[model samples]
Target: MAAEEGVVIACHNKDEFDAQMTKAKEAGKVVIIDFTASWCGPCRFIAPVFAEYAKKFPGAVFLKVDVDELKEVAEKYNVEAMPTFLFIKDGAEADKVVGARKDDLQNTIVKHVGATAASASA
Candidate 1:
Protein backbone atom coordinates (compact mmCIF):
# COMPACT_ATOMS: atom_id res chain seq x y z
CA MET A 1 0.00 0.00 0.00
CA ALA A 2 1.37 3.37 -1.05
CA ALA A 3 1.48 6.21 1.45
CA GLU A 4 -1.57 8.41 1.04
CA GLU A 5 -0.53 10.61 3.93
CA GLY A 6 -3.21 12.28 6.04
CA VAL A 7 -6.00 9.99 4.85
CA VAL A 8 -7.37 6.61 5.78
CA ILE A 9 -6.29 3.72 3.58
CA ALA A 10 -8.97 1.11 3.08
CA CYS A 11 -7.61 -2.42 2.89
CA HIS A 12 -10.00 -4.43 0.76
CA ASN A 13 -8.01 -7.63 0.69
CA LYS A 14 -5.41 -9.54 2.67
CA ASP A 15 -2.56 -8.43 0.46
CA GLU A 16 -3.30 -4.74 0.96
CA PHE A 17 -3.65 -5.28 4.67
CA ASP A 18 -0.29 -6.99 5.06
CA ALA A 19 1.49 -4.59 2.73
CA GLN A 20 0.24 -1.50 4.56
CA MET A 21 1.21 -2.94 7.92
CA THR A 22 4.67 -3.85 6.66
CA LYS A 23 5.09 -0.41 5.14
CA ALA A 24 4.16 1.29 8.37
CA LYS A 25 6.70 -0.80 10.25
CA GLU A 26 9.37 -0.06 7.66
CA ALA A 27 8.63 3.66 7.93
CA GLY A 28 8.72 3.43 11.71
CA LYS A 29 5.30 5.03 12.00
CA VAL A 30 2.47 4.17 14.33
CA VAL A 31 -0.59 2.55 12.73
CA ILE A 32 -4.24 3.01 13.67
CA ILE A 33 -6.27 0.15 12.31
CA ASP A 34 -10.04 0.50 12.36
CA PHE A 35 -11.68 -2.89 12.20
CA THR A 36 -15.24 -2.04 11.36
CA ALA A 37 -18.43 -3.56 9.99
CA SER A 38 -20.58 -1.86 7.40
CA TRP A 39 -23.84 -2.71 9.11
CA CYS A 40 -22.79 -1.22 12.46
CA GLY A 41 -24.18 2.24 13.15
CA PRO A 42 -21.62 3.24 15.75
CA CYS A 43 -18.88 2.34 13.35
CA ARG A 44 -20.41 4.69 10.80
CA PHE A 45 -20.71 7.50 13.34
CA ILE A 46 -17.07 7.45 14.43
CA ALA A 47 -15.69 7.10 10.95
CA PRO A 48 -15.22 10.82 10.45
CA VAL A 49 -13.40 11.27 13.73
CA PHE A 50 -10.98 8.53 12.71
CA ALA A 51 -10.39 10.28 9.43
CA GLU A 52 -9.87 13.59 11.23
CA TYR A 53 -7.28 11.96 13.41
CA ALA A 54 -5.53 10.71 10.31
CA LYS A 55 -5.23 14.29 9.07
CA LYS A 56 -4.39 15.71 12.48
CA PHE A 57 -1.61 13.21 13.07
CA PRO A 58 -0.16 12.89 9.61
CA GLY A 59 2.86 11.05 10.94
CA ALA A 60 0.69 8.12 11.89
CA VAL A 61 -0.77 5.75 9.33
CA PHE A 62 -4.54 5.24 9.32
CA LEU A 63 -6.02 2.04 7.92
CA LYS A 64 -9.59 0.80 7.68
CA VAL A 65 -10.59 -2.82 7.16
CA ASP A 66 -14.11 -4.14 7.03
CA VAL A 67 -14.42 -7.29 9.02
CA ASP A 68 -16.58 -8.95 6.41
CA GLU A 69 -14.15 -8.17 3.63
CA LEU A 70 -11.02 -9.13 5.47
CA LYS A 71 -12.11 -11.96 7.70
CA GLU A 72 -8.64 -13.40 8.19
CA VAL A 73 -7.16 -10.09 9.18
CA ALA A 74 -9.95 -9.43 11.67
CA GLU A 75 -9.52 -12.95 12.99
CA LYS A 76 -5.79 -12.41 13.40
CA TYR A 77 -6.46 -9.33 15.49
CA ASN A 78 -9.34 -11.04 17.30
CA VAL A 79 -11.69 -8.20 16.55
CA GLU A 80 -15.05 -9.01 18.13
CA ALA A 81 -16.62 -5.56 18.26
CA MET A 82 -18.07 -3.44 15.50
CA PRO A 83 -15.54 -0.64 15.58
CA THR A 84 -12.47 -1.94 17.29
CA PHE A 85 -9.51 0.39 17.09
CA LEU A 86 -6.06 -1.12 17.27
CA PHE A 87 -2.96 0.95 17.84
CA ILE A 88 0.12 -0.72 16.44
CA LYS A 89 3.79 0.19 16.67
CA ASP A 90 6.89 -1.65 15.50
CA GLY A 91 4.54 -4.20 13.93
CA ALA A 92 3.07 -5.09 17.28
CA GLU A 93 -0.07 -4.28 19.22
CA ALA A 94 0.35 -1.21 21.39
CA ASP A 95 -3.17 -0.42 22.62
CA LYS A 96 -6.77 -1.05 21.70
CA VAL A 97 -10.03 0.85 22.06
CA VAL A 98 -13.28 -1.00 21.48
CA GLY A 99 -16.55 0.70 20.51
CA ALA A 100 -17.14 4.23 19.19
CA ARG A 101 -16.21 6.30 22.21
CA LYS A 102 -14.78 9.49 20.75
CA ASP A 103 -13.05 10.65 23.91
CA ASP A 104 -11.23 7.36 24.42
CA LEU A 105 -10.18 7.31 20.82
CA GLN A 106 -8.88 10.88 20.90
CA ASN A 107 -7.02 10.46 24.17
CA THR A 108 -5.54 7.12 23.19
CA ILE A 109 -4.35 8.53 19.90
CA VAL A 110 -2.69 11.41 21.74
CA LYS A 111 -1.10 9.10 24.27
CA HIS A 112 0.47 6.79 21.68
CA VAL A 113 1.24 9.45 19.11
CA GLY A 114 2.86 11.67 21.71
CA ALA A 115 5.01 8.80 22.80
CA THR A 116 6.17 8.26 19.25
CA ALA A 117 7.04 11.93 18.90
CA ALA A 118 8.95 11.88 22.18
CA SER A 119 10.98 8.91 21.08
CA ALA A 120 11.71 10.32 17.64
CA SER A 121 13.04 13.55 19.10
CA ALA A 122 15.74 11.61 20.91
Candidate 2:
Protein backbone atom coordinates (compact mmCIF):
# COMPACT_ATOMS: atom_id res chain seq x y z
CA MET A 1 0.00 0.00 0.00
CA ALA A 2 1.03 3.66 -0.36
CA ALA A 3 2.62 5.44 2.60
CA GLU A 4 3.70 8.98 3.47
CA GLU A 5 5.98 10.92 1.09
CA GLY A 6 4.77 8.66 -1.74
CA VAL A 7 6.44 5.54 -0.40
CA VAL A 8 4.62 2.26 -0.92
CA ILE A 9 4.99 -0.87 1.13
CA ALA A 10 5.67 -3.37 -1.61
CA CYS A 11 6.26 -6.18 0.83
CA HIS A 12 5.33 -9.25 -1.13
CA ASN A 13 6.02 -12.92 -1.70
CA LYS A 14 7.71 -14.68 -4.64
CA ASP A 15 4.79 -14.43 -7.05
CA GLU A 16 3.91 -10.91 -6.04
CA PHE A 17 7.55 -9.83 -6.37
CA ASP A 18 7.67 -11.14 -9.90
CA ALA A 19 4.47 -9.37 -10.81
CA GLN A 20 5.59 -6.16 -9.21
CA MET A 21 8.92 -6.31 -10.98
CA THR A 22 7.13 -6.72 -14.28
CA LYS A 23 4.99 -3.68 -13.55
CA ALA A 24 8.03 -1.67 -12.50
CA LYS A 25 9.81 -2.61 -15.70
CA GLU A 26 6.89 -1.43 -17.80
CA ALA A 27 6.59 1.77 -15.77
CA GLY A 28 10.32 2.57 -16.01
CA LYS A 29 10.89 3.00 -12.30
CA VAL A 30 13.73 1.74 -10.18
CA VAL A 31 13.05 -1.00 -7.61
CA ILE A 32 15.02 -1.22 -4.41
CA ILE A 33 14.54 -4.57 -2.74
CA ASP A 34 15.52 -5.02 0.86
CA PHE A 35 16.13 -8.69 1.49
CA THR A 36 15.97 -9.25 5.22
CA ALA A 37 14.99 -11.71 7.93
CA SER A 38 12.99 -11.32 11.15
CA TRP A 39 15.54 -13.03 13.34
CA CYS A 40 18.47 -11.06 12.00
CA GLY A 41 19.49 -8.32 14.40
CA PRO A 42 21.16 -6.20 11.73
CA CYS A 43 18.13 -6.46 9.54
CA ARG A 44 15.87 -5.30 12.35
CA PHE A 45 18.27 -2.52 13.26
CA ILE A 46 18.29 -1.03 9.77
CA ALA A 47 14.62 -1.54 9.09
CA PRO A 48 13.63 1.96 10.16
CA VAL A 49 16.35 3.61 8.12
CA PHE A 50 15.35 1.63 5.07
CA ALA A 51 11.74 2.66 5.57
CA GLU A 52 12.81 6.25 5.89
CA TYR A 53 14.74 6.07 2.66
CA ALA A 54 11.72 4.55 0.98
CA LYS A 55 9.72 7.56 2.02
CA LYS A 56 12.46 9.95 1.04
CA PHE A 57 12.65 8.54 -2.47
CA PRO A 58 9.06 8.31 -3.64
CA GLY A 59 9.82 8.05 -7.33
CA ALA A 60 11.62 4.79 -6.62
CA VAL A 61 9.69 1.73 -5.54
CA PHE A 62 10.98 0.29 -2.28
CA LEU A 63 10.24 -3.34 -1.52
CA LYS A 64 10.86 -5.11 1.73
CA VAL A 65 10.90 -8.87 1.23
CA ASP A 66 11.25 -11.13 4.24
CA VAL A 67 13.85 -13.77 3.63
CA ASP A 68 12.33 -16.11 6.17
CA GLU A 69 8.87 -15.81 4.67
CA LEU A 70 10.13 -16.17 1.11
CA LYS A 71 13.05 -18.55 1.16
CA GLU A 72 13.08 -19.04 -2.58
CA VAL A 73 13.47 -15.32 -3.22
CA ALA A 74 16.42 -15.13 -0.87
CA GLU A 75 17.97 -18.05 -2.63
CA LYS A 76 17.31 -16.55 -6.03
CA TYR A 77 18.89 -13.26 -4.98
CA ASN A 78 21.81 -15.06 -3.37
CA VAL A 79 21.21 -13.29 -0.11
CA GLU A 80 23.64 -14.76 2.36
CA ALA A 81 23.53 -11.85 4.78
CA MET A 82 20.84 -10.43 7.04
CA PRO A 83 20.15 -7.21 5.14
CA THR A 84 20.99 -6.97 1.48
CA PHE A 85 19.95 -3.96 -0.59
CA LEU A 86 19.43 -4.68 -4.29
CA PHE A 87 19.07 -1.63 -6.52
CA ILE A 88 17.32 -2.64 -9.73
CA LYS A 89 17.10 -0.09 -12.52
CA ASP A 90 15.62 -0.57 -15.97
CA GLY A 91 14.50 -4.11 -15.03
CA ALA A 92 18.05 -5.16 -14.25
CA GLU A 93 20.28 -5.11 -11.18
CA ALA A 94 22.31 -1.91 -11.07
CA ASP A 95 24.02 -2.19 -7.70
CA LYS A 96 23.81 -3.77 -4.25
CA VAL A 97 24.85 -3.30 -0.65
CA VAL A 98 25.02 -6.08 1.96
CA GLY A 99 24.98 -4.31 5.31
CA ALA A 100 23.37 -1.66 7.52
CA ARG A 101 25.22 1.51 6.66
CA LYS A 102 23.17 4.65 6.23
CA ASP A 103 25.70 6.54 4.12
CA ASP A 104 26.26 3.65 1.77
CA LEU A 105 22.56 3.07 1.29
CA GLN A 106 21.92 6.73 0.57
CA ASN A 107 24.86 6.94 -1.78
CA THR A 108 23.77 3.84 -3.67
CA ILE A 109 20.31 5.27 -4.19
CA VAL A 110 21.66 8.59 -5.38
CA LYS A 111 24.16 6.88 -7.63
CA HIS A 112 21.53 4.86 -9.48
CA VAL A 113 18.56 7.22 -9.33
CA GLY A 114 20.53 10.44 -9.78
CA ALA A 115 20.43 13.56 -7.57
CA THR A 116 17.41 15.31 -9.00
CA ALA A 117 14.37 16.25 -6.96
CA ALA A 118 12.07 15.97 -9.94
CA SER A 119 13.22 12.46 -10.65
CA ALA A 120 12.81 11.49 -7.00
CA SER A 121 9.57 13.37 -6.46
CA ALA A 122 6.32 11.47 -6.43
Candidate 3:
Protein backbone atom coordinates (compact mmCIF):
# COMPACT_ATOMS: atom_id res chain seq x y z
CA MET A 1 0.00 0.00 0.00
CA ALA A 2 1.83 3.04 1.39
CA ALA A 3 5.57 3.15 0.67
CA GLU A 4 6.72 3.80 4.17
CA GLU A 5 9.91 2.70 5.95
CA GLY A 6 11.35 -0.74 5.31
CA VAL A 7 8.50 -1.90 3.09
CA VAL A 8 9.03 -3.46 -0.35
CA ILE A 9 5.55 -2.91 -1.71
CA ALA A 10 4.38 -5.12 -4.58
CA CYS A 11 2.30 -2.90 -6.85
CA HIS A 12 -0.17 -5.01 -8.84
CA ASN A 13 -1.95 -2.20 -10.70
CA LYS A 14 -1.71 1.39 -11.83
CA ASP A 15 -3.60 2.79 -8.86
CA GLU A 16 -1.37 1.02 -6.38
CA PHE A 17 1.69 2.04 -8.37
CA ASP A 18 0.69 5.72 -8.39
CA ALA A 19 -0.13 5.70 -4.69
CA GLN A 20 3.25 4.33 -3.71
CA MET A 21 5.13 6.63 -6.05
CA THR A 22 3.22 9.68 -4.85
CA LYS A 23 3.79 8.79 -1.23
CA ALA A 24 7.53 8.66 -1.73
CA LYS A 25 7.56 11.77 -3.89
CA GLU A 26 5.56 13.75 -1.36
CA ALA A 27 7.77 12.58 1.47
CA GLY A 28 10.98 13.54 -0.37
CA LYS A 29 12.17 9.94 -0.30
CA VAL A 30 13.89 7.84 -2.94
CA VAL A 31 11.91 5.18 -4.84
CA ILE A 32 13.34 1.96 -6.24
CA ILE A 33 10.94 -0.18 -8.26
CA ASP A 34 12.07 -3.57 -9.47
CA PHE A 35 10.28 -4.38 -12.69
CA THR A 36 10.07 -8.14 -12.62
CA ALA A 37 8.06 -10.88 -14.27
CA SER A 38 6.83 -14.12 -12.71
CA TRP A 39 8.12 -16.33 -15.53
CA CYS A 40 11.65 -14.96 -15.33
CA GLY A 41 13.98 -17.15 -13.32
CA PRO A 42 16.47 -14.37 -12.62
CA CYS A 43 13.67 -12.19 -11.35
CA ARG A 44 12.62 -14.95 -9.00
CA PHE A 45 16.19 -15.49 -7.86
CA ILE A 46 16.68 -11.82 -6.92
CA ALA A 47 13.36 -11.59 -5.09
CA PRO A 48 14.97 -12.31 -1.73
CA VAL A 49 17.80 -9.87 -2.47
CA PHE A 50 15.22 -7.18 -3.13
CA ALA A 51 13.63 -7.95 0.22
CA GLU A 52 17.02 -7.67 1.83
CA TYR A 53 17.38 -4.24 0.21
CA ALA A 54 14.03 -3.19 1.67
CA LYS A 55 15.34 -4.15 5.10
CA LYS A 56 18.73 -2.59 4.45
CA PHE A 57 17.34 0.63 3.07
CA PRO A 58 14.38 1.34 5.29
CA GLY A 59 13.97 5.02 4.46
CA ALA A 60 13.80 4.41 0.71
CA VAL A 61 10.66 3.36 -1.16
CA PHE A 62 11.05 -0.19 -2.46
CA LEU A 63 8.52 -1.65 -4.91
CA LYS A 64 8.13 -4.48 -7.41
CA VAL A 65 6.11 -4.59 -10.63
CA ASP A 66 4.97 -7.69 -12.51
CA VAL A 67 5.21 -6.64 -16.15
CA ASP A 68 2.84 -9.35 -17.35
CA GLU A 69 0.25 -8.32 -14.80
CA LEU A 70 0.67 -4.60 -15.40
CA LYS A 71 1.77 -4.10 -18.98
CA GLU A 72 0.84 -0.42 -19.19
CA VAL A 73 2.71 0.31 -16.00
CA ALA A 74 5.74 -1.44 -17.49
CA GLU A 75 5.39 0.56 -20.70
CA LYS A 76 5.02 3.81 -18.76
CA TYR A 77 8.50 3.26 -17.40
CA ASN A 78 9.72 1.59 -20.58
CA VAL A 79 10.87 -1.50 -18.78
CA GLU A 80 12.12 -3.74 -21.61
CA ALA A 81 14.46 -6.00 -19.65
CA MET A 82 13.32 -8.88 -17.45
CA PRO A 83 14.59 -7.38 -14.18
CA THR A 84 14.98 -3.65 -14.57
CA PHE A 85 15.42 -1.63 -11.44
CA LEU A 86 14.27 1.96 -11.74
CA PHE A 87 15.71 4.46 -9.29
CA ILE A 88 13.29 7.36 -9.32
CA LYS A 89 13.10 10.68 -7.51
CA ASP A 90 10.70 13.62 -7.45
CA GLY A 91 8.41 11.88 -9.96
CA ALA A 92 11.21 11.34 -12.47
CA GLU A 93 13.83 8.79 -13.42
CA ALA A 94 17.07 9.48 -11.59
CA ASP A 95 18.98 6.26 -12.31
CA LYS A 96 18.54 2.58 -13.17
CA VAL A 97 20.03 -0.91 -13.28
CA VAL A 98 18.67 -3.27 -15.93
CA GLY A 99 19.68 -6.64 -14.61
CA ALA A 100 19.80 -8.95 -11.57
CA ARG A 101 23.27 -7.94 -10.47
CA LYS A 102 23.41 -8.03 -6.69
CA ASP A 103 26.42 -5.74 -6.29
CA ASP A 104 25.05 -3.11 -8.64
CA LEU A 105 21.75 -3.15 -6.84
CA GLN A 106 23.32 -2.72 -3.41
CA ASN A 107 25.83 -0.09 -4.46
CA THR A 108 23.36 1.96 -6.45
CA ILE A 109 20.93 1.91 -3.55
CA VAL A 110 23.59 3.34 -1.33
CA LYS A 111 24.87 5.73 -3.99
CA HIS A 112 21.49 7.41 -4.46
CA VAL A 113 19.42 6.76 -1.34
CA GLY A 114 22.13 7.00 1.27
CA ALA A 115 23.71 10.06 -0.29
CA THR A 116 20.59 12.08 -1.04
CA ALA A 117 18.27 11.24 1.88
CA ALA A 118 19.68 13.82 4.25
CA SER A 119 19.68 16.55 1.62
CA ALA A 120 16.10 15.70 0.70
CA SER A 121 14.93 16.01 4.30
CA ALA A 122 16.56 19.38 4.75
Candidate 4:
Protein backbone atom coordinates (compact mmCIF):
# COMPACT_ATOMS: atom_id res chain seq x y z
CA MET A 1 0.00 0.00 0.00
CA ALA A 2 1.07 3.54 -0.70
CA ALA A 3 2.38 5.30 2.38
CA GLU A 4 0.72 8.36 3.86
CA GLU A 5 2.89 10.98 5.46
CA GLY A 6 3.81 9.83 8.99
CA VAL A 7 1.78 6.63 8.69
CA VAL A 8 2.59 2.95 8.70
CA ILE A 9 2.73 1.00 5.47
CA ALA A 10 0.51 -2.06 5.12
CA CYS A 11 2.69 -4.50 3.30
CA HIS A 12 0.57 -7.03 1.45
CA ASN A 13 3.02 -8.74 -0.87
CA LYS A 14 6.54 -10.03 -1.07
CA ASP A 15 7.72 -7.28 -3.36
CA GLU A 16 6.21 -4.59 -1.19
CA PHE A 17 7.69 -6.02 1.97
CA ASP A 18 11.12 -6.44 0.43
CA ALA A 19 11.18 -2.91 -0.85
CA GLN A 20 10.35 -1.60 2.58
CA MET A 21 13.08 -3.73 4.07
CA THR A 22 15.53 -2.42 1.54
CA LYS A 23 14.58 1.13 2.26
CA ALA A 24 15.13 0.64 5.97
CA LYS A 25 18.60 -0.83 5.41
CA GLU A 26 19.54 1.92 3.01
CA ALA A 27 18.48 4.57 5.46
CA GLY A 28 20.17 2.83 8.41
CA LYS A 29 16.89 2.93 10.28
CA VAL A 30 15.09 0.42 12.42
CA VAL A 31 12.13 -1.46 10.93
CA ILE A 32 9.20 -2.56 13.03
CA ILE A 33 6.90 -5.08 11.37
CA ASP A 34 3.69 -5.89 13.14
CA PHE A 35 2.48 -9.34 12.22
CA THR A 36 -1.25 -9.53 12.62
CA ALA A 37 -4.32 -11.32 11.27
CA SER A 38 -7.86 -10.24 10.49
CA TRP A 39 -9.37 -12.83 12.80
CA CYS A 40 -7.23 -11.75 15.72
CA GLY A 41 -8.97 -9.66 18.32
CA PRO A 42 -5.76 -8.51 19.96
CA CYS A 43 -4.53 -7.41 16.58
CA ARG A 44 -7.52 -5.12 16.32
CA PHE A 45 -6.89 -3.82 19.79
CA ILE A 46 -3.29 -2.98 19.04
CA ALA A 47 -3.86 -1.25 15.71
CA PRO A 48 -4.30 2.30 16.90
CA VAL A 49 -1.37 2.14 19.30
CA PHE A 50 0.82 0.85 16.55
CA ALA A 51 -0.13 3.78 14.36
CA GLU A 52 0.64 6.18 17.14
CA TYR A 53 4.04 4.50 17.39
CA ALA A 54 4.57 5.04 13.70
CA LYS A 55 4.11 8.73 14.24
CA LYS A 56 6.16 8.88 17.41
CA PHE A 57 9.07 6.90 16.01
CA PRO A 58 9.38 8.46 12.59
CA GLY A 59 13.03 7.46 12.33
CA ALA A 60 11.99 3.83 12.17
CA VAL A 61 10.20 2.12 9.33
CA PHE A 62 6.82 0.94 10.55
CA LEU A 63 5.06 -1.77 8.57
CA LYS A 64 2.08 -4.05 9.01
CA VAL A 65 1.91 -7.51 7.48
CA ASP A 66 -1.46 -9.19 7.43
CA VAL A 67 -0.68 -12.82 8.20
CA ASP A 68 -3.40 -14.12 5.92
CA GLU A 69 -2.58 -11.74 3.12
CA LEU A 70 1.12 -12.54 3.14
CA LYS A 71 1.36 -16.05 4.46
CA GLU A 72 4.67 -16.67 2.81
CA VAL A 73 6.19 -13.57 4.28
CA ALA A 74 4.88 -14.46 7.70
CA GLU A 75 6.24 -17.95 7.30
CA LYS A 76 9.58 -16.59 6.19
CA TYR A 77 9.75 -14.53 9.32
CA ASN A 78 8.98 -17.68 11.33
CA VAL A 79 5.95 -16.12 12.90
CA GLU A 80 3.62 -18.60 14.55
CA ALA A 81 1.41 -16.22 16.49
CA MET A 82 -0.83 -13.26 15.87
CA PRO A 83 0.43 -9.86 17.02
CA THR A 84 4.07 -10.83 16.79
CA PHE A 85 6.42 -7.93 16.34
CA LEU A 86 9.77 -8.14 14.58
CA PHE A 87 12.31 -5.39 14.95
CA ILE A 88 14.99 -5.10 12.28
CA LYS A 89 18.02 -2.88 12.11
CA ASP A 90 20.93 -2.90 9.70
CA GLY A 91 19.25 -5.77 7.85
CA ALA A 92 19.30 -7.92 10.96
CA GLU A 93 16.92 -8.99 13.69
CA ALA A 94 17.28 -6.62 16.59
CA ASP A 95 14.48 -7.69 18.90
CA LYS A 96 10.94 -9.08 19.04
CA VAL A 97 7.82 -8.62 21.13
CA VAL A 98 5.21 -11.38 21.05
CA GLY A 99 2.09 -9.95 22.66
CA ALA A 100 -0.18 -6.92 22.90
CA ARG A 101 1.19 -5.63 26.17
CA LYS A 102 1.16 -1.92 25.53
CA ASP A 103 3.90 -0.95 27.96
CA ASP A 104 6.36 -3.56 26.75
CA LEU A 105 5.80 -2.67 23.15
CA GLN A 106 6.07 1.03 23.78
CA ASN A 107 9.17 0.82 25.93
CA THR A 108 10.91 -1.55 23.54
CA ILE A 109 10.38 0.75 20.59
CA VAL A 110 11.14 3.83 22.58
CA LYS A 111 14.42 2.37 23.82
CA HIS A 112 15.50 1.29 20.38
CA VAL A 113 14.45 4.55 18.86
CA GLY A 114 16.62 6.39 21.34
CA ALA A 115 19.53 4.24 20.29
CA THR A 116 18.83 4.97 16.66
CA ALA A 117 18.85 8.66 17.41
CA ALA A 118 21.99 8.36 19.47
CA SER A 119 23.96 6.70 16.70
CA ALA A 120 22.79 9.18 14.12
CA SER A 121 24.02 12.05 16.25
CA ALA A 122 27.30 10.32 17.02
* Candidate with the larger lDDT of 2 and 3: 3
- Collision count for each candidate, in order: 0, 0, 0, 0
lDDT of 1 at 60: 71
Poorest stretch of ten by lDDT in candidate 4 = 113-122
Residues forming the 10-long window of minimal summed lDDT in candidate 1: 113-122
lDDT of 1 by residue, 10-110 (tens): 77787776766786788877777877776656656876777777778755787777789777777777776466777787788887775478777776667
The sequence of per-residue lDDT tens digits that candidate 3 reaches over residues 48-103 is 78876877886577777778878676677787646677878777887877547877
In model 2, residue pairs whose N, Cα or C atoms come closer than 3 Å (at least 3 residues apart or on different chains), thus clashing, are none
lDDT of 1 at 102: 79
lDDT of 2 by residue, 1-122 (tens): 33533443445567766655565677666777777666545655766777777677655776666777786776766776466777678877876775478677877777665544233445
Question: By descending lDDT, how would the candidates be arranged?
Answer: 3, 1, 4, 2
For lDDT, candidate 3 versus 4, the one ahead is 3
Candidate 4 ranges with C-alpha deviation above 4 Å: 1-3, 116-122
Can you give the lDDT of residue 17 in candidate 4?
69
TM-score of every prediction relative to native: 0.78, 0.71, 0.78, 0.78
lDDT against true structure, model 1: 0.71
What's the lDDT for residue 11 in model 1?
75
